[model samples]
Target: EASLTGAGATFPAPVYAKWADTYQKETGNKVNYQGIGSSGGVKQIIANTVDFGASDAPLSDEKLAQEGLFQFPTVIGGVVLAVNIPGLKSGELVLDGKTLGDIYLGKIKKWDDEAIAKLNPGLKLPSQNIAVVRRADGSGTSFVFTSYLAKVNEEWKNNVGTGSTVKWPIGLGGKGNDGIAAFVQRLPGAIGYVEYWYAKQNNLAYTKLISADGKPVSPTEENFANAAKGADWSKTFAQDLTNQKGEDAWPITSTTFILIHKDQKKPEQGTEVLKFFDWAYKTGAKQANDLDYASLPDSVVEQVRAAWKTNIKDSSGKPLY
Candidate 1:
């Protein structure tokens, strides 16, 4: 394998970029990746342009069958609520999905809104006006974030159906996870949802969420892993890992995925694509962990490899794996 090209979701871009470079150095294969939003990635894959497409929100099972596409989880991550409160450190603020849903609904306007205050009994909350920041584009990040909100609050679920894009009740909009992170960092009393790595890298104050486990949970590799522990990787994972029932599960956990067609024209390129991922699966765990992302577990990787063998084939009907 000499070179390959792929593009998709920015939520996993930082880790993907790292894997690309390290993979190049280790195997002498170059992988070019673009961190365009998930919508663009799906469009590119459907158009048959890129070798593989990445997405945070996996396309639905019906859509996958319609497009003759296959998707699998590569890594697990959490969507964090990062804030710009006047005098709070990251994770100092705690929130549950229902109150967060109300905030986005514009029902809770102040930083010290009674609903939020009840969650944190002792912290001194400023009476600052709350400004919600959200993704302006159709994004996988948005899908995961809003999906969770809709799940926890009936009002939100009935009023604002979740998808990559939805009718917004309130908030300023940023284009990507990076954009949300940067914008919220500078805007006071701002609350925005972004991937955990983006919040950490941007040095924003993030929150502890009320997990489905009924505890305030912070995003960590272990927490994300805990959320994914029960996933049935045998089936296509167009599903969410949110609000898992374990005490340590991170409430907003989601998997970053990649897409490819079952029919392959260029056999050599198919091999390259498969090999690149194989290398990443076997070697990229440490790098993934370093950035607070969870690499797919060994058991999951085996399932993914099996899928590739049966699905991503050349014109000859041979398997990639």
Candidate 2:
């Protein structure tokens, strides 16, 4: 059997690695994946540099059309506000969209700013300067966080918005999710956004984000699923899944997508790629929860499978699946 190779969004790397490890043990097929950022993944798929690419931020319809690629959501997760304060506790910090935007834009410099105090009420805030850490590479996590900021703050929409890459006004840049987490952990007063699993593994302090409905929500599978609950999957063929609505919805919840070209020069590799997702989707749902990701609902999974049959076609005009 041919080995499967993939590269893309680092946000889901840990979970994907776990799935690949188990799948290989059971099927005797090797899966090779790289934790390159989302933008790199997009480039790889467009350039036919890899068998498949992964991204937390969905590709735009126009871009997909131009590239002759098909994309589908493979997993749901959230970007978390992780911090390095020694005395801080996970989920004890509260942040709203607007204030978070301010922090990233260098408008909010102090940890004890009135804006943060107002949100946390009686919680103690330090007088230390905030050291913001962000992704240096183009990232889907940046897309989701910036997309929410664009929706809530008109100023942010004009100045900075969702994209694989953004002009970060403040903070140091880290290469990948693990890099950012490590930066925050080592630097005093440092704060950064990374996938939930990284935050949990490092035991970093994480902030509970105020949902669209004004309730503070953590990055749990339930909250991520709630955010994606009423999504119109049919229309999501080319749109970003960030900034959706629901009562328990996490505003920063986003889906990681896998991209495959309709015409594959290496048909067998493409077929193996599809088979890998089929195996993961059918068997990896339970594993997702353990990694702090939400599994797709049964109905959505069926829709995705149908879409794969229709869109992920090969040069011979046959479904890869």
Candidate 3:
């Protein structure tokens, strides 16, 4: 019997669960994971509490080396801004980073703030207070979203620096992406950021983002792919794809990474980890796509497979490659 364990990042949990279930049926290999936020995931891997770990914010190479872990990306997804306007359709609302940061920062309290109304001139404006929703737990989703805000808004950077959990000025707290999505579903005038799939999963209305490129693009797998086309991974797997120059790039795109020990206490289990990823790389692309998550390109996937031989190994320095 072969089994493995991983935990982290709710961003890719849906598709990763899909891969695990399909693999189990095919090979009788059990892979269990927990959607314990990304901070917990990093802590779990570092503490050797699980066979592997998952995080959306990739650890720096120095950080990975210090902890004796190997890191690589599995899926590319976007962080979407979801809102619960009384009668608006999905993608009908549009916002840019500065205005988005201000809305969340409590600067622009009303939906009809001139900054906001300026963006959506002709839309029927509402007098509702913008109810900001945010993650309560330590979250990579928070890190990515706030990091993008930090890049575009100095006020956001100075007042609320990026982290798994930043000091939110004005908002109700949701536990994870699912929690945020649920809050948005319940609260009219609520605005929240969540992983793209959660918005779809909950049937919430997601907005188009006006990008640094001076164009607004809706969140879609193809648009996410357009942003991913600019990925250069010689650095940490946690590279930022926000505000990329591509016309189609969905301004808040990011990748989810998996972390595993390079020299495992149980080499056999480590081999199974590699094999599970190997199977997914070859067979799970379509599964990832069905949910709008982009699998790493085949060329990059090949490099990741090759990396396992070098980064993960058996006792006595025997290579898996």
Candidate 4:
């Protein structure tokens, strides 16, 4: 009879909730996971208020070492630009990185901006004001999105660098992926970034983004997988999958992570957390796919388990997994 509490990354909350429900039923170990934004999750876990913290922004090696924590990648997900425009269908709008950066920077102010119109010739983009929407809280989704923006746009790189949160120059502030999706659906001429699952679940029209190979790509599990194919997770498990160079890669792909104390404060709870993830790695692939997220590749999963058995340990120095 064990229970666990983990919170973080609304980007992966849909699949996490599914995994938790099935895990609880089969193992009889209840799991409570809150879809709080990633920053809140990190704070709670660091304060020892929860069993584990999850985030799309992987902490740096220095940061992890300083905090006495270990991190591992759990699932791969994509951040998509979703939009609300009268009579526009999903993927009807096309955008590239520089144009998107400028829109958020308050440079490109209209839906009919020449930069956007160039991408979707003859698409009848409205002459309405462009309503940019952004994360109001510290968020890994923003991290991934801003990282790509910085890579493609020189102005954005110099001015608004990457992080879980940044000084968003323009936009309405939404609290989570859910909040962004809701706001995009309501605000006409709006564009917002969120996890692909949220855009799909909410039926918000998502734009086809130009990938690193300069191809306009749709947000799909396969595209996300392609983006992650180049990820070298050997060192920090913190590889930036955004703006990956591949024909099929989605520009905004990212891997969400879990962070836990290396020496468990509550060995039983830590053991339970490892078991839940182990179960998810082995059993939750289809669930993850159905919800538009990619599970870790087998090799990475094996590496994760190896880390768990070697690095995560009880206070007496015994392995938790």
Best by lDDT: 4
Q: Model 4 clash tally?
A: 0
TM-score of each: 0.97, 0.95, 0.97, 0.98
Better of 2 and 4 by TM-score: 4
Candidate 1 lDDT by residue in tens digits, 88-179: 77889999989999999999999898998999999889999999999898799998988898899889999987988899899999988899
Candidate ranking under TM-score, highest first, comes to 4, 3, 1, 2
Q: Candidate 2, residues 206-317: lDDT per residue as tens digits?
A: 8988888788887787888888887777666444455566777887888788888877778788888888888888999888889989987777678878877887766778
Screening candidate 3 with a backbone cut-off below 3 angstroms (N, C-alpha, C), the clashing residue pairs are none
Q: Which regions of candidate 4 fall more than 4 Å away from where they truly are?
A: none
- Model 1 CA deviation exceeding 4 Å by range: none
Give candidate 3's TM-score.
Answer: 0.97
Candidate-wise lDDT, in order? 0.87, 0.84, 0.88, 0.91
Model 1 per-residue lDDT at 201: 91
**Once model 1 is optimally superposed onto the true structure by TM-score, how far is the C-alpha of residue 86 displaced, in angstroms?**
0.7
Models sorted by lDDT, best on top? 4, 3, 1, 2
Residue pairs in steric clash, candidate 2?
Answer: none
